[PDB]
Every structure is written in structure tokens, then in C-alpha cells.
Structure 1
Amino acid sequence: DCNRALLTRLHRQTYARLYPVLLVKQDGSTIHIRYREPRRMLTMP
């Protein structure tokens, strides 16, 4: 059921290049975050 809303693109008329990034906050939890820095990962302290 988690997959209902997951497939989408940004609908704002003009925007920057969006790159998949993997974010790790301080959990052990990770989120897919679309951000303009191509770097494959960022981990939060």
C-alpha cells in the first residue's frame, strides 16, 4: 500500500536537475531525497 503515491515527477513549470540522493538521519533510517547535488548519499549527525 506504500506504493500508491510513490511514482511522480515535479509539476512546477521550470526547475533544476533533480538527482536521487540517499539521506540517513540519526536513526539507522534512510529516505530517498530528491536533491540537486548528484552525490549518492548524505548522512545526518
Structure 2
Amino acid sequence: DCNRALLTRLHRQTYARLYPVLLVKQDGSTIHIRYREPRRMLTMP
């Protein structure tokens, strides 16, 4: 059921280019942030 609401686009009428980003907070965990910078990955300390 984790994939229930996971499938979407941003519904605002006028908006920037949104690119898939892998984000590491401090866990060892990773998230997918849709963010305007094409960069493959970012990580927080």
C-alpha cells in the first residue's frame, strides 16, 4: 500500500521543470525529492 498515492505529477498551472533527486538525510536513508536542479543526488550532514 506504500505505492497508493506515490504516483503523481504536480498540478499547478504554470511551473518550472521538475527533476528526480536522491536525497540523503542523516540516517543512511534516502528519499526522492522532485527538485528543479537536474543533480542526481544531494546529502545532509
Q: TM class by shorter-chain length?
A: over 0.9
Q: CA deviation at 1:22?
A: 0.1
- The list of structure 1 runs, each at least 4 consecutive aligned residues, that deviate by more than 4 angstroms after superposition, is none
Q: Supply the RMSD in Å over aligned alpha carbons.
A: 0.4
Q: Could you tell me which runs of 5 or more consecutive residues in structure 2 were left unpaired when the two chains were aligned.
A: none
CA distance in 2: counterparts of 1:25 and 1:3, whole angstroms: 22
CA distance in 2: counterparts of 1:30 and 1:9, whole angstroms: 20
Q: Percent identity?
A: 100
TM-score normalised per structure 2 = 0.97
TM-score normalised per structure 1 = 0.97
Q: How many residues align?
A: 45
